[PDB]
Amino acid sequence: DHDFAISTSFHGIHNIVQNRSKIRRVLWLVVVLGSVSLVTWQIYIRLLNYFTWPTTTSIEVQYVEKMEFPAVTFCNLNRFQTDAVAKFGVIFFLWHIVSKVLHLQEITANSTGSREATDFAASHQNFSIVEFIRNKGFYLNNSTLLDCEFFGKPCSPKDFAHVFTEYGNCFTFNHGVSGRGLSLLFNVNQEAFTDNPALGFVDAGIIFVIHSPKKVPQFDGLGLLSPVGMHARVTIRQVKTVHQEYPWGECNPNIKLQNFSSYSTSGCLKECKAQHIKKQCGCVPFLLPGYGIECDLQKYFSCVSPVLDHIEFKDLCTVGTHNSSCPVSCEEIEYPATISYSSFPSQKALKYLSKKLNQSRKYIRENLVKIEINYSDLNYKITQQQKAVSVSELLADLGGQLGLFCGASLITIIEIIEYLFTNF
Amino acid sequence: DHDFAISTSFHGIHNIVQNRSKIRRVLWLVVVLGSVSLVTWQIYIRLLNYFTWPTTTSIEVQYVEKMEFPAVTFCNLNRFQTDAVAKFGVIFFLWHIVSKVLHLQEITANSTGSREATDFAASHQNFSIVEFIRNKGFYLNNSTLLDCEFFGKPCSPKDFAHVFTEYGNCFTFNHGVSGRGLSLLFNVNQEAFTDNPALGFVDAGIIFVIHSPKKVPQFDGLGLLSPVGMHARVTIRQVKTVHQEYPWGECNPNIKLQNFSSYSTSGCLKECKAQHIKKQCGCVPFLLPGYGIECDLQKYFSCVSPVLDHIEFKDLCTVGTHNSSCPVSCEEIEYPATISYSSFPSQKALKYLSKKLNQSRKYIRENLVKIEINYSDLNYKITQQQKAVSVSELLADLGGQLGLFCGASLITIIEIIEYLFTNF
Amino acid sequence: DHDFAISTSFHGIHNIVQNRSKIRRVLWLVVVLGSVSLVTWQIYIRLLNYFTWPTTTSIEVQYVEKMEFPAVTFCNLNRFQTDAVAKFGVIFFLWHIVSKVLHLQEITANSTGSREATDFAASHQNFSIVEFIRNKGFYLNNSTLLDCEFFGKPCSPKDFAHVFTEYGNCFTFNHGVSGRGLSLLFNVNQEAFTDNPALGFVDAGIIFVIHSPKKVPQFDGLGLLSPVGMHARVTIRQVKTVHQEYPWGECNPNIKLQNFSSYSTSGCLKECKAQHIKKQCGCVPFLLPGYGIECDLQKYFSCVSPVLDHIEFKDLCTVGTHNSSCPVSCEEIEYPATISYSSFPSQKALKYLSKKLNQSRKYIRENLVKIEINYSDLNYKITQQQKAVSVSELLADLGGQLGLFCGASLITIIEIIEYLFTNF
């Protein structure tokens, strides 16, 4: 055992053989023990750091000669045609009740409008809200859309897809090279269209949102505005973010949507909502994709509203955090926007448009909206969360801890076998 | 010595023993010397890099289901009640002189208004500016605040705290779940309120700032605006930044504010200002916390203004850099905002509000302001400056330099002792 | 050979000598071979990672008591003086043809305006467009610029430099301490100035851009707007980015502009454009720096427009990517801006300005624009792309791979020489 111990490849062990003295041998053995203990210390420390599943964040600017341009959704701040609602006021409260699925506000059950709506529902249960709103709501034609240009080229209403939202009859664009982009001129027409001030909605103009082609708009408090009588210029850049899985970040790719749709936060949320409503009530609302039987109107007062209140109160639906019901998507793309304004009907131009439209000098300043949406930069920002230590990396670093200390990988094990025989 | 030298644990030393030739021994000794020199080189290099006190910057998106919502401060762009100032024009110049503490502008000493203000100060030294402005300034009641909603729920004036600022009688909100947020409707009332055009302030509307609950608003050129007759929608996200200490960044935690208030850049600045004014003049102005005796009006013309001019000229007060009088705080939270607009008095709604307020159609369009402030995203950005090398890390890396070269930690020292005995 | 092999400094080699058994020697030799193979594996892996030329991205906040303030460029949304154009309508189409160099749009060759412009060009080839526009275009004097203040101090028109752009007669500011900054009051004068609605330009107001002192404005869809009758407040921060060379980023410093001008993306682009036009056509347009002979008017219809169409179609000019004709600059500085508005002519102030300007209560609200531009912080963001591995770094890391495995740098080579002799 002495020959192997002396021949063992270690600085202290070699020193023990060289000095050939009791005090010397003990001192070198102690030095070796301390060095290996520090090695172990470092090892452990660095391994516990890896077992935090640590991350680094990179952020970089990416470029192309011709980028894809995001979809847009437009709505009239005024809902309904004047004529079709003057004699049918209860429609406002009926629509507010139906749109709970979206707006998630609360309505005083004791209010007079609620009583009238409940009476009508009890009297006309065969009435169809969607078939009505799709006809008497905001409409897009030659009468409404005076002009539209994408990239120098003309555009026509037929290019616009149709979507239901809070406001009803919401139209979308570009549905599924720098400084240039989409340009429009709307005739908001406060003579035809109207809304109930009582419920708010006291403001006139165009409301729009910017989203990916394959997403559904949200609106709510996230929707952008443009006023009557001013040209709005909107300059945007694409922004992309990337997330890692549950150990390192919050992404949960494993979750997939019904109908084989690509994952999206909003999608997840609303699909959860629909699942709860259907399972508890057996029907689904009109403002959600065709999961199944559309709910009867009476169910909205009897079933849907209490169910939504319960969902809200119990927090059955959650967003964001890794434990959440609706985790953050792997990748997301946002379109930040900055807005500047200019007086639209120039006095020179005002008479011209007057002539053009055969409209009074009062009407044009009270009804027309011009919008431009433009790409500020042919480059876009990507932000990537990255795993700070791969398995392999651990290996590389593992060796490091030993550095500055007794330099050995197999000698320590070689001595361990020597000790095992020495102890056996 | 030869036995120890031959037995010394080093590649070149082992080669010297193996070859047993003069040329061979010299060649291996030279190779070992070069390897250790490169080791040292690397060592030194990496240590000099550590002694730059280097940093890395991480940036990451953090989540909660219901965040805390920032405080807000509102002011009227028009200062004073018409009635109380029609016969007391000197008040404008008096207030401008008093507000030097804040606005830090310059006033022509030869101007007629300055002469009149100086005469009044010489005649009515017992006059109290603050007791006047708190009564004849902008006020917030049922008459002024037509509506206020926080998160669906009603809000009332009593919820609003009172604060003095440049504009006087500045009211704050929320003083010390997604897409939703605060909504208001002000009656700015250009019949009652007024201001001196001569001094600027030619523009009518609401001025507001967004800040942390526990901070004091700054306004100045950093305040946001909303016009008369348009609904402003303001969409915000919380933004947080973190800084390291003087060796790595600019933070100086050691500095604490009087009255045991948590550190803040602005707070530091203004406290410094107050310290200088008090020590040099023995009094403090009304627009700063109650450090001590409020300054008499005459002191403003005689003492305060020259002192502020001297402070400005001599740069006695500084912000930002680590040497500065007012270093950057450890952590800071900002609220970037994007604004969109829409015509507020819809023709339908205009008659309604007319009726409601018993006001002319002319009055409403030229006096009302609507504001919404909303959280765009239940996630907030944090940016962290981080120390790129810990003490421990140095240890780990220290080892690396030796890598690729004569692999040893204690053998080099072992040979050093062998050389010491060899030389002794 | 046996003595050297046994004496060779390696864990397995030492074990081979110690055990002195065939099975033992083979096992230790295999262990050593596996360890060195893993070493090599790691080595290779990490070297292939280095040969991706990887990068890390830092982003940090930098500070000064008094920063330099960016230049600004202002233009009138209305081009031409009414008087000089009422009898000379063809000027609109002529200018549109000339400005192709900039706007890069398309004009219907069959349009009546095009025919009239072509006839005039065929009739008045000695006509000079630039000498006309510089006189009948937008002008800046006491009549136009009611007020201008930089940092508390007065400013005068003579401070403004003159520049040609799309709009013609574009004036610039500040040409080659916190919250404060530039403030202006323009008289846009829709009585004097005008434009052709037919071609768009239906909107009235001031259009401006923010750029570095030493750059040329671009405008196009990247220009900011301010409306008539509202005070605009613009809050900005400086933003700086840094890029690495072709192996790591996309910067190509080697490219320099003619006339010894510092590199700029836009500059590169336009210089390329001018080079192509001159070489193919032998002349240059007026809206580009004085490369040489200014092109005759007929050339615009005959030569310049087809050449620009060909350039567009063939993609002879490119921006951004490392292969591109116009690579990204080493460093770039941008000025993001956020805008808020307030009703400009307060009813108190309205009469005052009426008196001042001797103008009607109609005229002021229909013609005046007020702008402020301010610095949001005494601090600016820099973003730096950084080479993630230096040559030296490779050395350091090279060692790491060997770590955790047979610990040797020269012993492996020492054994290699032993094997070479063993095989020879």
Numbering used by the authors:
A (entry chain A), B (entry chain B), C (entry chain C): 38 to 213, 224 to 471
Study text:
To reveal how hBASIC responds to Ca2+ removal, we prepared grids of hBASIC reconstituted in nanodiscs in the presence of 2 mM EGTA to chelate ambient Ca2+o and analyzed the sample using single-particle cryo-EM. The overall resolution of both classes was lower than hBASIC in the presence of Ca2+, with both class 1 and class 2 having a global resolution of ~3.4 Å. In accordance with the electrophysiology data, we observed two distinct particle classes that differ in their pore conformations, which we thus refer to as ‘EGTA-closed’ (class 1), representing a non-conducting state, and ‘EGTA-open’ (class 2), representing an expanded, conducting state. In hBASIC, Ca2+ removal induces a rotation of TM1 and TM2a away from the three-fold axis, resulting in a 4 Å helical displacement of TM1 and a 6° rotation of TM2a. EGTA-closed resembles the Ca2+-closed conformation whereas EGTA-open is dramatically reorientated such that the positions of the L425 and N426 side chains are switched; N426 now facing the vestibule and L425 making contacts with the β1-β2 linker. This is reminiscent of the conformation seen in the MitTx-bound open structure of cASIC1a41. Removal of Ca2+ triggers a 4 Å lateral displacement of the β1-β2 linker, repositioning the tyrosine residue and promoting rearrangement of the β11-β12 linker to open the pore. Removal of Ca2+ leads to rotation of the TM2 helix, displacing these residues from the center of the pore and expanding the extracellular vestibule. The gate is significantly widened in the EGTA-open structure, having a pore radius greater than 2 Å, which is sufficient to accommodate partially dehydrated Na+ ions. Removal of Ca2+ causes rearrangement of this loop to displace the histidine and increase the pore-radius from ~1 Å to ~3 Å.
